[PDB]
Design a protein around this ligand. Sequence first.
Ligand SMILES: *[C@@H]1O[C@H](CO)[C@@H](O[C@@H]2O[C@H](CO)[C@@H](O)[C@H](O)[C@H]2NC(C)=O)[C@H](O[C@@H]2O[C@@H](C)[C@@H](O)[C@@H](O)[C@@H]2O)[C@H]1NC(C)=O
Ligand SMILES: *[C@@H]1O[C@H](CO)[C@@H](O[C@@H]2O[C@H](CO)[C@@H](O)[C@H](O)[C@H]2NC(C)=O)[C@H](O[C@@H]2O[C@@H](C)[C@@H](O)[C@@H](O)[C@@H]2O)[C@H]1NC(C)=O
Ligand SMILES: *[C@@H]1O[C@H](CO)[C@@H](O[C@@H]2O[C@H](CO)[C@@H](O)[C@H](O)[C@H]2NC(C)=O)[C@H](O[C@@H]2O[C@@H](C)[C@@H](O)[C@@H](O)[C@@H]2O)[C@H]1NC(C)=O
Ligand SMILES: *[C@@H]1O[C@H](CO)[C@@H](O[C@@H]2O[C@H](CO)[C@@H](O)[C@H](O)[C@H]2NC(C)=O)[C@H](O[C@@H]2O[C@@H](C)[C@@H](O)[C@@H](O)[C@@H]2O)[C@H]1NC(C)=O
Ligand SMILES: *[C@@H]1O[C@H](CO)[C@@H](O[C@@H]2O[C@H](CO)[C@@H](O)[C@H](O)[C@H]2NC(C)=O)[C@H](O[C@@H]2O[C@@H](C)[C@@H](O)[C@@H](O)[C@@H]2O)[C@H]1NC(C)=O
Ligand SMILES: *[C@@H]1O[C@H](CO)[C@@H](O)[C@H](O)[C@H]1NC(C)=O
Ligand SMILES: *[C@@H]1O[C@H](CO)[C@@H](O)[C@H](O)[C@H]1NC(C)=O
Ligand SMILES: *[C@@H]1O[C@H](CO)[C@@H](O)[C@H](O)[C@H]1NC(C)=O
Ligand SMILES: CC1(C)Cc2cccc(CO)c2O1
Ligand SMILES: CC1(C)Cc2cccc(CO)c2O1
Ligand SMILES: [Fe+3]
Ligand SMILES: [Fe+3]
Ligand SMILES: [Zn+2]
Ligand SMILES: [Zn+2]
Lengths: 426, 426
Amino acid sequence: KNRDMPLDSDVFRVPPGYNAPQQVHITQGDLVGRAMIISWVTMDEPGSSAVRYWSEKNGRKRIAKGKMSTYRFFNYSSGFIHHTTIRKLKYNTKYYYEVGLRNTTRRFSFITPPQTGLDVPYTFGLIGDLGQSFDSNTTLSHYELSPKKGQTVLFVGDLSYADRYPNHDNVRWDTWGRFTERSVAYQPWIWTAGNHEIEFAPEINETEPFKPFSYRYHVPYEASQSTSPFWYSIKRASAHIIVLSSYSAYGRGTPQYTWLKKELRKVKRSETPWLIVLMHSPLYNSYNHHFMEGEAMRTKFEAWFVKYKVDVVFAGHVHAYERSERVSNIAYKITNGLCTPVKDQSAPVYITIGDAGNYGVIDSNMIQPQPEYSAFREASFGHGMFDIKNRTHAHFSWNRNQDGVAVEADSVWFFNRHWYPVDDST
Amino acid sequence: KNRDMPLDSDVFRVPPGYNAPQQVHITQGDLVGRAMIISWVTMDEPGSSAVRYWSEKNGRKRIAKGKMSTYRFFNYSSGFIHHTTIRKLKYNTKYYYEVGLRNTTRRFSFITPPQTGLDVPYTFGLIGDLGQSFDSNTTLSHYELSPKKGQTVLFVGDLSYADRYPNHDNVRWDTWGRFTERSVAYQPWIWTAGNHEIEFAPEINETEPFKPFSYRYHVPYEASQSTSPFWYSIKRASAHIIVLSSYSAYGRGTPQYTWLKKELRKVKRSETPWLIVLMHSPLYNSYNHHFMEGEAMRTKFEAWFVKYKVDVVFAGHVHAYERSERVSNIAYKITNGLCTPVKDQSAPVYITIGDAGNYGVIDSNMIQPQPEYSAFREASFGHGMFDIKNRTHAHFSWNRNQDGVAVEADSVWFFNRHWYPVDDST
Ligand SMILES: *[C@@H]1O[C@H](CO)[C@@H](O[C@@H]2O[C@H](CO)[C@@H](O)[C@H](O)[C@H]2NC(C)=O)[C@H](O[C@@H]2O[C@@H](C)[C@@H](O)[C@@H](O)[C@@H]2O)[C@H]1NC(C)=O
Ligand SMILES: *[C@@H]1O[C@H](CO)[C@@H](O[C@@H]2O[C@H](CO)[C@@H](O)[C@H](O)[C@H]2NC(C)=O)[C@H](O[C@@H]2O[C@@H](C)[C@@H](O)[C@@H](O)[C@@H]2O)[C@H]1NC(C)=O
Ligand SMILES: *[C@@H]1O[C@H](CO)[C@@H](O[C@@H]2O[C@H](CO)[C@@H](O)[C@H](O)[C@H]2NC(C)=O)[C@H](O[C@@H]2O[C@@H](C)[C@@H](O)[C@@H](O)[C@@H]2O)[C@H]1NC(C)=O
Ligand SMILES: *[C@@H]1O[C@H](CO)[C@@H](O[C@@H]2O[C@H](CO)[C@@H](O)[C@H](O)[C@H]2NC(C)=O)[C@H](O[C@@H]2O[C@@H](C)[C@@H](O)[C@@H](O)[C@@H]2O)[C@H]1NC(C)=O
Ligand SMILES: *[C@@H]1O[C@H](CO)[C@@H](O[C@@H]2O[C@H](CO)[C@@H](O)[C@H](O)[C@H]2NC(C)=O)[C@H](O[C@@H]2O[C@@H](C)[C@@H](O)[C@@H](O)[C@@H]2O)[C@H]1NC(C)=O
Ligand SMILES: *[C@@H]1O[C@H](CO)[C@@H](O)[C@H](O)[C@H]1NC(C)=O
Ligand SMILES: *[C@@H]1O[C@H](CO)[C@@H](O)[C@H](O)[C@H]1NC(C)=O
Ligand SMILES: *[C@@H]1O[C@H](CO)[C@@H](O)[C@H](O)[C@H]1NC(C)=O
Ligand SMILES: CC1(C)Cc2cccc(CO)c2O1
Ligand SMILES: CC1(C)Cc2cccc(CO)c2O1
Ligand SMILES: [Fe+3]
Ligand SMILES: [Fe+3]
Ligand SMILES: [Zn+2]
Ligand SMILES: [Zn+2]
């Protein structure tokens, strides 16, 4: 069918005034929380890439300077894209920032996270495969109305679904920018790259993977000694978050592979006890759709995730909700017969959470019966929250769109794999 | 325990004359064999990129123009690299070609293949992980001294092993170019990217993978609508050869995955009976060294190879020889326990032929006992020959450096999977 919100929808409205900055969004700008990448688009002319900013406390108004860029895609011309990095911020404080300093100015605000620490509580939103359908709008609306009150969104891939349109009509990137602004202009969303961001379209001489995405959404990849925007890590509060790319190389000797192997070695559980991995394609998935796609990355990375006692791996891709048991399937040796996943308290829980809305379609077909390794699964739209209480406890909840904003359809306690490695099995 | 040929070795002699072209190599330059890429380096000055060439049939001298490029790697500065494509060649005819038209000219010849066809015989050589050890030299001589007479080399990756040197001393790329000249200047070598081509070294601000390889060795990739030099196909005689990149992305939706999926659809067994796939890392391997590394790509591609009746898949990486049975391992679904390879007449034979010499170390450790899927494996240096008699028969043989050039240690008839799918089991 067609359940994408019409161009003239209220979520798509353009901020008024000559060259008013639009599609504003922010994300963590450094490795630990002291910086922030502020981004936006101006449509009438290049404009300034300057950000004004100040804490509500100490009232000194500083000015950050950034860069402007443009891109083309087939018959589409981007507007003027700005990214600026505000650095040396104070932990745990509200900051006001402004963009569009030369003409129409707009003001926004954000709150830096506490300094990383073993016992720092923090609430992450979890959203995958958002799209811009009516379902999409409902999810975002639930998240912002959650009483748990999310401070950062971990976003597991597939943003605008703009590549489903005629010529990947990139206007549909612009709309998704203006739609998400009401959330991401005030809190970082941590970006993962999904298959709808590949935009590989040889048929119209666009053969550079990830182009529109890579122009519109910067991440702090050098911060973690990565050579690419598609894999990086950041530390925020008590969490160490590794972000991977289901669609870049991960063979032995590749950049991503090499970077990951080192990065894990840099994880200090006494400083960030919550080790979280993000990636678009799930490695454990009992839905028919995309079943076993994640098998290739699993052969390369699963054993590591276990060696390093990862707490949780979030994925999207599959348009539905799943939560694995703590299992591993890493004893296989071709001829040894050992290919069944087994209970394993060192392994992460795997969560598919790619049901935020996409283009309005849910994946309902499941392998039957439910496999031993699947703890819970349901084909409903929604988003999740991973809520860190302390060094031993994180409460994860899944909320459905058909339910009330306070209802938790599925809800489990995560016991830390380093500080409290006990059967949290449901 | 350093077995590389010294810099003052004869095989590394510099051709004489001011700005004499060196490191001359050719490779197919179009899809079906009517074009040829001539490559060389000049050291003294840029020089001309023109190539003079005539056929023996017509004795009409013609000029083709190409491009010159250069690169740097850390503190290394390349010479002047030339790539020129000759086009509109006539099938099955002898050409002479000349390079270095301004100062020192040098003359070489090649022979276009026959026009592609169902019953067109052709002898392909197989070489992998060649290197520049004394072992490397022996393999190359056995190859050129072969009664079988290879007409084209299918080269499964790992060229110079320059990257084993301090800062990857790219000088050892130059020496390798000069050393292989006595073969590749007179017959094409088809190039596969190996792990020693990756040359990802962020420690010295060299982070563009395949850089040196990319500049020195061009391939006719746009010819098969690939968008990258690391995966592509050519048609030569009665074979359709597909080259893949073990160290590029092959995830679902990525360029290589997309290209391969479409390319297999394009194969016409009625034009090119013998379907051959080259990659660096083996899908089946029963040796310790690199055991199971090919698992990831296998999970993505194996079923396609079975589905399209691939006749043979060649690889290297493992420094030995191995030949599998026709097997598949494509029934696994995580929980059905079906993870054992089975005889499968519809599947390719998998050959590991990465034993041309490298830097002089053979991989002798094998997993015992020999798996059912493994038909033959020996830890000796040498090369292979894939000799196509016609649409039904091809004869594969393996020559050992320790044997006479005319002796075959392993020998086996392939019965075409599309035209003559009789059990060709040994
Ligand atoms: C967008 O911001 C610009 C910078 O503030 C405005 O222009 C500047 O206005 C100053 C005082 O009006 C004047 O000294 C400058 O010449 C002028 N422009 C530049 C290039 O700095 C601009 O205002 C409009 O454009 C300028 C050239 C004038 O003609 C005004 O009359 C226009 O309103 C702002 N643009 C708009 C459309 O608001
Ligand atoms: C980390 O946070 C957990 C959730 O807030 C704490 O658990 C809870 O402790 C309450 C009293 O503090 C108790 O009434 C609740 O039943 C319990 N909730 C759960 C899900 O267990 C936890 O507190 C510690 O660990 C628990 C299991 C008890 O032994 C408490 O006495 C401990 O203080 C917090 N752990 C730490 C290290 O602070
Ligand atoms: C590129 O850098 C290398 C070191 O990072 C140069 O080699 C080093 O030179 C040192 C003093 O010049 C010498 O004592 C070291 O043994 C050596 N380091 C290594 C690991 O080889 C290299 O140099 C040239 O060749 C070397 C062997 C010497 O003959 C030097 O005199 C030469 O400059 C550098 N290459 C270039 C093109 O600059
Ligand atoms: C490389 O070839 C060039 C011609 O293709 C030479 O330049 C030429 O040398 C001829 C000497 O026999 C001279 O008459 C021509 O004028 C000249 N053609 C040009 C300049 O394009 C070149 O010779 C060297 O450089 C020239 C400019 C003079 O300086 C000569 O004395 C040099 O030999 C050849 N290079 C070398 C180093 O042999
Ligand atoms: C295609 O090439 C095959 C390999 O050369 C041919 O088989 C060979 O045929 C020879 C006589 O032509 C015979 O003496 C060889 O022993 C035989 N070699 C093998 C390995 O079988 C094949 O020839 C056809 O089929 C064979 C089996 C014979 O029965 C002949 O009658 C046929 O020529 C070639 N196919 C064709 C159709 O030519
Ligand atoms: C691009 O092409 C489509 C038809 O292919 C057309 O309808 C659309 O208006 C064009 N967009 C622009 C901005 O040129
Ligand atoms: C999206 O949700 C917002 C907030 O709940 C609402 O005000 C708006 O009308 C919705 N937009 C559409 C097109 O559904
Ligand atoms: C390499 O082999 C060739 C041919 O066998 C021979 O002419 C030459 O002596 C050898 N050179 C070295 C360095 O082994
Ligand atoms: C099957 C593909 C090409 C992959 C994929 C992942 C997530 C969502 C969609 C729907 O187009 C999708 O289409
Ligand atoms: C273990 C590694 C670094 C991998 C690899 C691939 C191909 C050749 C070699 C050399 O031993 C090699 O050593
Ligand atoms: Fe999706
Ligand atoms: Fe090798
Ligand atoms: Zn997806
Ligand atoms: Zn290798």
